[PDB]
N, CA, C and O atoms as a MOPAC input file, in Angstrom:
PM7 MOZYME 1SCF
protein

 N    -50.42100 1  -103.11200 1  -155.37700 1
 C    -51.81100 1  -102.70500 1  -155.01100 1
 C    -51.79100 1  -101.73900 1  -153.82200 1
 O    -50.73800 1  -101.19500 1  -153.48900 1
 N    -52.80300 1  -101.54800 1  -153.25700 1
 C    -52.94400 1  -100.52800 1  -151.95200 1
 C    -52.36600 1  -101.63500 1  -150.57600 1
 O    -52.37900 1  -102.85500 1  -150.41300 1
 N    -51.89100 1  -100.46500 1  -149.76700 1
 C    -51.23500 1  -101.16800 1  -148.08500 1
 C    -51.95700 1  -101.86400 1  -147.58600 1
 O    -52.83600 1  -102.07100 1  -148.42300 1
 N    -52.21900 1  -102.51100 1  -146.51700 1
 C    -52.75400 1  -102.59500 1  -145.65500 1
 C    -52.69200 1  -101.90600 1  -144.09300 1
 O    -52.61400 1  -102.71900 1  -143.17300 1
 N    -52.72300 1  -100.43000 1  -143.73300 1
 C    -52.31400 1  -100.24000 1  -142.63600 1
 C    -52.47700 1   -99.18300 1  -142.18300 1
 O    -53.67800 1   -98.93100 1  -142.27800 1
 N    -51.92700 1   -98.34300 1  -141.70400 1
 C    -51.54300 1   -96.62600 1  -141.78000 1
 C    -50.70400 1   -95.79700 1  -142.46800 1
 O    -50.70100 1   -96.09400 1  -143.66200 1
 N    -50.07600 1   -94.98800 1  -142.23200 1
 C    -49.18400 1   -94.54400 1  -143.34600 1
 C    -47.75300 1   -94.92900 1  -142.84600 1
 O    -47.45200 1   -96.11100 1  -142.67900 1
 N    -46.92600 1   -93.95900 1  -142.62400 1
 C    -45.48100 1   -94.40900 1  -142.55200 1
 C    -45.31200 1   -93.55200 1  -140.60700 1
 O    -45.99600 1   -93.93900 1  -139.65900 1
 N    -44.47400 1   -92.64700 1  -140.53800 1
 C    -44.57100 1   -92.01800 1  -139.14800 1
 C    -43.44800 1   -91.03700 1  -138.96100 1
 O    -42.37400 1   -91.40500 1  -138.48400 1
 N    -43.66800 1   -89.83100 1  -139.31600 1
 C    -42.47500 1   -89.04100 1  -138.85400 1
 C    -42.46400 1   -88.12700 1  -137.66800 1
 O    -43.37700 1   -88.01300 1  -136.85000 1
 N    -41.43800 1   -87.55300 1  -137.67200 1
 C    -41.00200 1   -86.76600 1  -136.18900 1
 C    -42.45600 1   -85.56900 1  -135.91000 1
 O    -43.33800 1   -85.66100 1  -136.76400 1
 N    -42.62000 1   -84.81000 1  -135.09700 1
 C    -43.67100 1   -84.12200 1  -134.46800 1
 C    -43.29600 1   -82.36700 1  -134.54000 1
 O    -43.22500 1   -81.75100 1  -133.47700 1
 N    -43.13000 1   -81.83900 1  -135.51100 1
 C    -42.97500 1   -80.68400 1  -135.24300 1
 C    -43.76000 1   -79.67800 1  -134.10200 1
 O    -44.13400 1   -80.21300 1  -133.05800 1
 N    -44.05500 1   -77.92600 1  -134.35000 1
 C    -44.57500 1   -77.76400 1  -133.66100 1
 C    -45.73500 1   -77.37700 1  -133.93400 1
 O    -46.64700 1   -77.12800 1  -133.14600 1
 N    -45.72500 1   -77.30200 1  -135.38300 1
 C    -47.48500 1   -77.52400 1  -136.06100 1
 C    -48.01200 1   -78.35600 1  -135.90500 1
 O    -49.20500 1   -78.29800 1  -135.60900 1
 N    -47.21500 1   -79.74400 1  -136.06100 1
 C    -48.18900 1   -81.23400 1  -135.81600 1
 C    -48.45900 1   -81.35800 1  -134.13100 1
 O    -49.13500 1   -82.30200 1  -133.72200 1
 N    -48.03000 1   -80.59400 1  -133.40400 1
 C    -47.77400 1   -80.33900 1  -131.90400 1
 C    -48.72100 1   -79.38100 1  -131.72400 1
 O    -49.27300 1   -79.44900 1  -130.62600 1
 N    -49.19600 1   -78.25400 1  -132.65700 1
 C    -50.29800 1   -77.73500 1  -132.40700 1
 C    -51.66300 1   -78.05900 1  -132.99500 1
 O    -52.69500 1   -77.44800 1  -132.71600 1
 N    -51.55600 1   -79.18500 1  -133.91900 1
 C    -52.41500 1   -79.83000 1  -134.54000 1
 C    -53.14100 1   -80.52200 1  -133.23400 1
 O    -54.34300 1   -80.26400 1  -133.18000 1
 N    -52.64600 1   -81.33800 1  -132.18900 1
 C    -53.05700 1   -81.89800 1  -131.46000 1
 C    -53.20700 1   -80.67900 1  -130.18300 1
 O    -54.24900 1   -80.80500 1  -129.53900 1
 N    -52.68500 1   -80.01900 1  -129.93200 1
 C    -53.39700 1   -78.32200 1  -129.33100 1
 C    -55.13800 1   -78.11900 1  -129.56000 1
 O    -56.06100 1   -77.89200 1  -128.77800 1
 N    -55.06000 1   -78.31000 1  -130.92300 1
 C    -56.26100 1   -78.04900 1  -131.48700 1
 C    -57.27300 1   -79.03200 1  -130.64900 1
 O    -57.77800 1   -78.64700 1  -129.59400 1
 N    -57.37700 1   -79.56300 1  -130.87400 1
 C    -58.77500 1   -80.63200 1  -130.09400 1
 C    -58.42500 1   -81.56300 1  -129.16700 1
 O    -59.14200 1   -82.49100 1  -128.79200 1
 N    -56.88800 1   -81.22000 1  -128.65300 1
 C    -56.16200 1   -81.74300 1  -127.45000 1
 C    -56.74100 1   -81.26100 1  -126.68500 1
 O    -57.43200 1   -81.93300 1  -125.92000 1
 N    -56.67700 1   -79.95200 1  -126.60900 1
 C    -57.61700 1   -79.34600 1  -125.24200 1
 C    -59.10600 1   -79.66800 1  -125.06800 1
 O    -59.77900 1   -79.77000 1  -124.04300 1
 N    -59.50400 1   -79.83200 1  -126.67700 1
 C    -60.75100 1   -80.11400 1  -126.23300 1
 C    -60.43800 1   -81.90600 1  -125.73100 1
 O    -61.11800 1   -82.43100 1  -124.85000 1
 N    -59.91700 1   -82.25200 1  -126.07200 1
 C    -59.61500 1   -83.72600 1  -126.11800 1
 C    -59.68100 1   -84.21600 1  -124.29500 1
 O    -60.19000 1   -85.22200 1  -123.80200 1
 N    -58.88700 1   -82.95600 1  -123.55500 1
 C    -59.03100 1   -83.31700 1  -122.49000 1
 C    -60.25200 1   -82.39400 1  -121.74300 1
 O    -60.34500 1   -82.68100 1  -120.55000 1
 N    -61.02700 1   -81.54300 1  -122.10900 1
 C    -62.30600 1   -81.49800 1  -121.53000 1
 C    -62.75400 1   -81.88200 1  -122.01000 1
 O    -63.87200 1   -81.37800 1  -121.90300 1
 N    -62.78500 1   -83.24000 1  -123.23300 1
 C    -63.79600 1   -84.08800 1  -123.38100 1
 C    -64.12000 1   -85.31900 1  -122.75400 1
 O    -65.27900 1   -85.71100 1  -122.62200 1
 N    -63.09800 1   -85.94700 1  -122.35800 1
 C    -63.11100 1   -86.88300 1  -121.20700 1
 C    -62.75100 1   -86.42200 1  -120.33600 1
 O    -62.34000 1   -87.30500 1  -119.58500 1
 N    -62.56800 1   -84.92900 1  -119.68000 1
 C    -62.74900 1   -84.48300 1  -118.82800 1
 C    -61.06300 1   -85.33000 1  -118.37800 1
 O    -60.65600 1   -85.62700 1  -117.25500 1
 N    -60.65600 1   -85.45000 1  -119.19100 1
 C    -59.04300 1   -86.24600 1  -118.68300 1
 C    -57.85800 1   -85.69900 1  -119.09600 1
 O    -57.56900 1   -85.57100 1  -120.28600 1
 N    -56.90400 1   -85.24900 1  -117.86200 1
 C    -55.95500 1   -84.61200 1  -118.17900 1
 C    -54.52600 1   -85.28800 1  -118.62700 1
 O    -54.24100 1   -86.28300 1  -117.96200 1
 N    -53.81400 1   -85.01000 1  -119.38900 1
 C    -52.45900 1   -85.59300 1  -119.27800 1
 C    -51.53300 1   -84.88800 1  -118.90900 1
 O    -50.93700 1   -85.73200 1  -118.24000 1
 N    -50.90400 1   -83.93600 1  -118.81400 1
 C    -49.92500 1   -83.42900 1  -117.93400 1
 C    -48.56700 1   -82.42900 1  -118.72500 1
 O    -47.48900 1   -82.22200 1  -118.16700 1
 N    -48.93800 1   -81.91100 1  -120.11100 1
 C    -48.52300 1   -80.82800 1  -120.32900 1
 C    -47.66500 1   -81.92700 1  -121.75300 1
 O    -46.54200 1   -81.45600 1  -121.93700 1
 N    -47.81100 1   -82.62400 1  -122.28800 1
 C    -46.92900 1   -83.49900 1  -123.51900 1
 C    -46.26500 1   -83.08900 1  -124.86500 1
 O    -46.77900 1   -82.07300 1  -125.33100 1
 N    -45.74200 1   -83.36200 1  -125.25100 1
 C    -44.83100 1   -82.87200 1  -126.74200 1
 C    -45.03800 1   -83.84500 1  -127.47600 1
 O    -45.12200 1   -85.06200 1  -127.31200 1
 N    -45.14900 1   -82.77600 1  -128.76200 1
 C    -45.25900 1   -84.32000 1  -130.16700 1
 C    -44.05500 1   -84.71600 1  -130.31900 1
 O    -43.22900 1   -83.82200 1  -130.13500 1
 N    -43.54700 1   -85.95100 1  -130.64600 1
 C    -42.74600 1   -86.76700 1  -131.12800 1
 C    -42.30200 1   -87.30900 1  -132.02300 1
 O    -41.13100 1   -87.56700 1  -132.30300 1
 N    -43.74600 1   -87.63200 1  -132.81300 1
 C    -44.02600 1   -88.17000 1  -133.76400 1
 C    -45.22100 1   -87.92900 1  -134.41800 1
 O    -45.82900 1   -86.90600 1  -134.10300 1
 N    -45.87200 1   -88.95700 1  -135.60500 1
 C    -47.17800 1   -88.22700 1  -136.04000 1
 C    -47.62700 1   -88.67300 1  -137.44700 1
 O    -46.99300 1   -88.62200 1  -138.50000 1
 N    -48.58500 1   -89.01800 1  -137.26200 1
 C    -48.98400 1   -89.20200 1  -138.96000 1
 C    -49.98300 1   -88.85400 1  -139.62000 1
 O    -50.35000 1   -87.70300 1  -139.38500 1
 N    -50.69600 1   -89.54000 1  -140.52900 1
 C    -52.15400 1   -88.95700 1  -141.15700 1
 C    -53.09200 1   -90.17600 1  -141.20800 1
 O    -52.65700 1   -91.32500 1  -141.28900 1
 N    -54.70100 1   -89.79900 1  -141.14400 1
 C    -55.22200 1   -90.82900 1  -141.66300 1
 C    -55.52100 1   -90.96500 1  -143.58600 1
 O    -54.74500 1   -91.01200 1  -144.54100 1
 N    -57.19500 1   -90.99300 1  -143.44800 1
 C    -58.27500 1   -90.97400 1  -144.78700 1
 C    -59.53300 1   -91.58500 1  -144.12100 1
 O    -59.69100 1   -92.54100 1  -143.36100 1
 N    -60.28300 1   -90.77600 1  -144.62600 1
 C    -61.72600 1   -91.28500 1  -144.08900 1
 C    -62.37200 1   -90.26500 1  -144.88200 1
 O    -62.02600 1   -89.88300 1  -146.00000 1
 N    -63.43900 1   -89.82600 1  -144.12000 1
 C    -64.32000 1   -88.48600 1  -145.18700 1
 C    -63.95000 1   -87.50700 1  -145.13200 1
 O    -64.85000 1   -86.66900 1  -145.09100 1
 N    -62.59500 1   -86.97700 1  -145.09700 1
 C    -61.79300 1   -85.96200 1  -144.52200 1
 C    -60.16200 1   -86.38300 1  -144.47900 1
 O    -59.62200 1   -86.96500 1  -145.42000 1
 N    -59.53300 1   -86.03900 1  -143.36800 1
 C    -58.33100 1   -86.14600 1  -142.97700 1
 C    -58.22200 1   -86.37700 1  -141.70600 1
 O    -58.24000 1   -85.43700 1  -140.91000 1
 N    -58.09700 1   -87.59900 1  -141.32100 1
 C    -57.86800 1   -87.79800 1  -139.36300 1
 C    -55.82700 1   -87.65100 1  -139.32300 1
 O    -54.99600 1   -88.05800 1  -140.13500 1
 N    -55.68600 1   -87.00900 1  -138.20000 1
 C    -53.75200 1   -86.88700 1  -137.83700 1
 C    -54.06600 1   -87.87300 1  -136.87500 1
 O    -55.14500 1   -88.40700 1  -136.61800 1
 N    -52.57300 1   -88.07400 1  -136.22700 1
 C    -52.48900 1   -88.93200 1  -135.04800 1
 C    -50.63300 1   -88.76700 1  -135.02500 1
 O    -49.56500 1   -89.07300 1  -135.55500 1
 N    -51.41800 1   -87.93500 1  -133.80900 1
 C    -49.80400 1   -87.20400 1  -133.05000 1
 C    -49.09900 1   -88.16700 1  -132.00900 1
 O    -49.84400 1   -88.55700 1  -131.11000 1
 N    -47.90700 1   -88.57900 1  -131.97900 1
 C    -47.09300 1   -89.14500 1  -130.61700 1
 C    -46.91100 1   -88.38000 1  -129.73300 1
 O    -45.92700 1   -87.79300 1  -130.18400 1
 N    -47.12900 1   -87.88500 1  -128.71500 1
 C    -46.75700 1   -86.83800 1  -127.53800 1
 C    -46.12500 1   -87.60600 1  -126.70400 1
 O    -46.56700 1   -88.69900 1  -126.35300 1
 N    -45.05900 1   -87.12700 1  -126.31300 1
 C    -44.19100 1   -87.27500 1  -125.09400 1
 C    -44.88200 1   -87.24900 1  -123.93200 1
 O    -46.02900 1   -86.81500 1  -124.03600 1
 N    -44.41100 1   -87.69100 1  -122.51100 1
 C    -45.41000 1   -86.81000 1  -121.22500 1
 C    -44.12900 1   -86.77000 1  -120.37600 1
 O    -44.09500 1   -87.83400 1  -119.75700 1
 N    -43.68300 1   -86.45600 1  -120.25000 1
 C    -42.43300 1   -86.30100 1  -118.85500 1
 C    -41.20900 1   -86.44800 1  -119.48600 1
 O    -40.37900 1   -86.93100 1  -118.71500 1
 N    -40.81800 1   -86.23700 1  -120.49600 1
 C    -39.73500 1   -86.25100 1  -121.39600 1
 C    -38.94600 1   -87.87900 1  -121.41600 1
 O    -37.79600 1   -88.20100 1  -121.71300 1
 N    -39.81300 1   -88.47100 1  -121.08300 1
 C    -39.64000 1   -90.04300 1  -120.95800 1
 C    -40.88800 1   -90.98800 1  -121.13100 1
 O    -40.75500 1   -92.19500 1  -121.33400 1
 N    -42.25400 1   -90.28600 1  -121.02700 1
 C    -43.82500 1   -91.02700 1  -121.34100 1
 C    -43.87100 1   -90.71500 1  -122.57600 1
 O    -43.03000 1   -90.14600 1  -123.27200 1
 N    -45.21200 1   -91.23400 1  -122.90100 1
 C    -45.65200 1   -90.66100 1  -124.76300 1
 C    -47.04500 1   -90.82800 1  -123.99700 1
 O    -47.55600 1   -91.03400 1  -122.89600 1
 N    -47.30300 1   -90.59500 1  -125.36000 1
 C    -49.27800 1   -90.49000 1  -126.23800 1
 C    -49.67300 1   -90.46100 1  -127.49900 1
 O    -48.90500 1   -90.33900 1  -128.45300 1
 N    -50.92300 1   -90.57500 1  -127.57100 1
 C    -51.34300 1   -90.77300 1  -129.57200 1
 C    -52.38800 1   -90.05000 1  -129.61900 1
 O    -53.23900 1   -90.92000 1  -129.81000 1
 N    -52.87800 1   -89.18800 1  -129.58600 1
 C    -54.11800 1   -88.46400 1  -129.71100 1
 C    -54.53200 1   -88.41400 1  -131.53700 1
 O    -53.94800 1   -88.72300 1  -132.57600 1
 N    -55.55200 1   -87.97300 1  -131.25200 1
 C    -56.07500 1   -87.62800 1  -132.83800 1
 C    -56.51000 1   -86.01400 1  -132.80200 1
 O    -56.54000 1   -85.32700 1  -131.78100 1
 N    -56.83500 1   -85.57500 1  -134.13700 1
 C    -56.72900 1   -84.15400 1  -134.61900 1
 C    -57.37700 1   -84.77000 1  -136.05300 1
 O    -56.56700 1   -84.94200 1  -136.96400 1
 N    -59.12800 1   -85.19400 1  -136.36600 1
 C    -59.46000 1   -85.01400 1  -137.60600 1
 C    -59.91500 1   -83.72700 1  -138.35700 1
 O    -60.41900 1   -82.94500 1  -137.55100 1
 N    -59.90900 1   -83.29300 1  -139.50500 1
 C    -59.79700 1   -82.37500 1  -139.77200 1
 C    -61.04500 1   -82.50600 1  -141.05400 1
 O    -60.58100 1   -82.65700 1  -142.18400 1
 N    -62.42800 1   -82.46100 1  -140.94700 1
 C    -63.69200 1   -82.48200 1  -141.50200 1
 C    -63.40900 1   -81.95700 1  -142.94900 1
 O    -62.45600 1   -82.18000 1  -143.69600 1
 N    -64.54400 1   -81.18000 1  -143.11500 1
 C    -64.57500 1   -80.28300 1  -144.79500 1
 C    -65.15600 1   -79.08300 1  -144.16500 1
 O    -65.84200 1   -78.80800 1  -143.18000 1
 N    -64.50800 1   -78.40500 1  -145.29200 1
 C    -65.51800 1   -76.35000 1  -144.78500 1
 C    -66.84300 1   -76.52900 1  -145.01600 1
 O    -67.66600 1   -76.20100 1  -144.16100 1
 N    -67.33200 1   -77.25900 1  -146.60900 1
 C    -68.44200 1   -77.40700 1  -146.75400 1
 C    -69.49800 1   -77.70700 1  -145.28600 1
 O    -70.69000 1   -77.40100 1  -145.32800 1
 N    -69.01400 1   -78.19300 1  -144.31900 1
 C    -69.65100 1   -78.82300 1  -143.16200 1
 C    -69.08000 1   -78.16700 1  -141.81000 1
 O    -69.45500 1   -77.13900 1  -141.24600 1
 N    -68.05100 1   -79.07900 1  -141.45500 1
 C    -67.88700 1   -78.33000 1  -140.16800 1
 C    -66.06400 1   -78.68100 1  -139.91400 1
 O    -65.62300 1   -79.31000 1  -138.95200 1
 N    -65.30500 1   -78.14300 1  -140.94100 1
 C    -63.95100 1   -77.75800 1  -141.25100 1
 C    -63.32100 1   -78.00800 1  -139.71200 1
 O    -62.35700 1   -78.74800 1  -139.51900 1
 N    -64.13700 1   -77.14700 1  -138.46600 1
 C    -63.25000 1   -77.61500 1  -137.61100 1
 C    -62.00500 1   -78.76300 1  -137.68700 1
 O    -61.51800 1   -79.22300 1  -138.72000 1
 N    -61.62500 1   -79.09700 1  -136.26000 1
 C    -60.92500 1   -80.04300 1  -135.98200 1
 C    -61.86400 1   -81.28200 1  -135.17400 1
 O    -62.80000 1   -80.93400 1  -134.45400 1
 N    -61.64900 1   -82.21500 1  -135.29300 1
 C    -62.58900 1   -83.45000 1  -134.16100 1
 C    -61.53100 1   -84.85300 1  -133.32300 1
 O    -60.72200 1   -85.63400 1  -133.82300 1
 N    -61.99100 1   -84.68800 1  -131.94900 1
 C    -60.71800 1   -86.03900 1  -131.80700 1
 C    -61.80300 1   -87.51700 1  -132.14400 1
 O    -62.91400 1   -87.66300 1  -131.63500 1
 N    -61.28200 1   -88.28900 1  -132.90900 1
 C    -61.43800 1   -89.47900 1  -133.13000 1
 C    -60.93700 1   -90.34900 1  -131.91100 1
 O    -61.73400 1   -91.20600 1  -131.53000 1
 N    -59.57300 1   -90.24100 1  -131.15700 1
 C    -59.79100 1   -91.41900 1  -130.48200 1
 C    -58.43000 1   -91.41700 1  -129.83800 1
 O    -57.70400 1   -91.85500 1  -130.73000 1
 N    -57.61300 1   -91.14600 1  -128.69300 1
 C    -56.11000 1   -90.71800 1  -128.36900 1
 C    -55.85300 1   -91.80500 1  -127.90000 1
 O    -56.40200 1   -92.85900 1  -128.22000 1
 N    -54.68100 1   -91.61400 1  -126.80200 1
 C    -53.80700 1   -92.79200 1  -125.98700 1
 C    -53.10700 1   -91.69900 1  -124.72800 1
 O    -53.14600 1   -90.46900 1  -124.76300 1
 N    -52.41400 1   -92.64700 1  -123.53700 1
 C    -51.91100 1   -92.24900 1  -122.33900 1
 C    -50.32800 1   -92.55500 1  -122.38200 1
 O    -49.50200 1   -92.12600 1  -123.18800 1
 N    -50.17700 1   -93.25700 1  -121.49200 1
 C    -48.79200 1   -93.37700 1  -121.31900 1
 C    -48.67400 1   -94.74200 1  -122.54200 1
 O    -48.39300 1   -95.80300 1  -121.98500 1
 N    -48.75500 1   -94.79500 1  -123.27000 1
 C    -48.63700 1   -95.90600 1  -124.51600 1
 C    -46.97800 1   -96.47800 1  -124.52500 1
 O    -46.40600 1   -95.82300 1  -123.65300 1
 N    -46.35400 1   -97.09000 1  -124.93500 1
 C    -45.37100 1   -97.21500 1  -125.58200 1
 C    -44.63000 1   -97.12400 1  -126.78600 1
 O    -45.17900 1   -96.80000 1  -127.83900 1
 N    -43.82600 1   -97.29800 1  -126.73200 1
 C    -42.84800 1   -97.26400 1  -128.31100 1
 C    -43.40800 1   -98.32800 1  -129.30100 1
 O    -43.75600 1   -98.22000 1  -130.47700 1
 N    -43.37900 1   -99.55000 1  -128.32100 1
 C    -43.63700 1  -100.56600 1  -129.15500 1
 C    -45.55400 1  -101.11700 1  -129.67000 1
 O    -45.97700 1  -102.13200 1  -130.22200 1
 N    -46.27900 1   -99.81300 1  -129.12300 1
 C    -47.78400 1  -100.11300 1  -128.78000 1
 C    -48.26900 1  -100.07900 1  -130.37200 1
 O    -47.44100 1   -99.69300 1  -131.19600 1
 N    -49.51300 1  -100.45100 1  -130.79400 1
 C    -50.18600 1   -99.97100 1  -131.87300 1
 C    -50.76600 1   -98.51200 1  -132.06400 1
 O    -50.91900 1   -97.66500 1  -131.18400 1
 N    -51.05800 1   -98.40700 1  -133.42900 1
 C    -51.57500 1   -97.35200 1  -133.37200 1
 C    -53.13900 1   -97.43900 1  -134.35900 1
 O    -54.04500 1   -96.60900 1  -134.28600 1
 N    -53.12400 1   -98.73500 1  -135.29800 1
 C    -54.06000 1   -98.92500 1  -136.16100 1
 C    -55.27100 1   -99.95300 1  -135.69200 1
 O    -55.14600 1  -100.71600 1  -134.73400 1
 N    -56.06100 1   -99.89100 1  -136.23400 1
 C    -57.43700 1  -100.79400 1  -135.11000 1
 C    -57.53900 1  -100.05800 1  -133.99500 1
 O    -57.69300 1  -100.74300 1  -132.98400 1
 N    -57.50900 1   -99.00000 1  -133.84300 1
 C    -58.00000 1   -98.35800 1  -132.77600 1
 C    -58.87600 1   -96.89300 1  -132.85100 1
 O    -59.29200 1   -96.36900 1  -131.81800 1

């Protein structure tokens, strides 16, 4: 039958690294909160009425992060939108229910 969960999780290129570029920046003048210059790591996809990502970023070549990068319809507003990120998170942190 169907999972229960998210998808699976691979490495962070520098598209999925500019995926989170995309509404990263807005991400941090949206809470007006900075993180400190990060690299993707990792990264996956959602499903919803569209396509939500959810990038791992590094922060100090030893921190991480989880930001989001949803990605709407043209019909509407195609942009990019953040759904919902993370800070200094861990390896071992969640990423689903959130």
């Amino acid at each position: 039958m169907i999972p229960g969960g998210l998808s699976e999780a691979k490495p962070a290129t520098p598209e999925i690294q500019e995926i989170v570029d995309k509404v990263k920046p807005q991400l941090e003048e949206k809470t007006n909160e900075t993180y400190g210059k990060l690299e993707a790591v990792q990264y996956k996809t959602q499903v919803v009425a569209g396509t939500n990502y959810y990038i791992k970023v590094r922060a100090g070549d030893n921190k991480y992060l989880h930001l989001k990068v949803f990605k709407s319809l043209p019909g509407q507003n195609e942009d990019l939108v953040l759904t919902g990120y993370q800070v200094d998170k861990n390896k071992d942190d969640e990423l689903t229910g959130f």
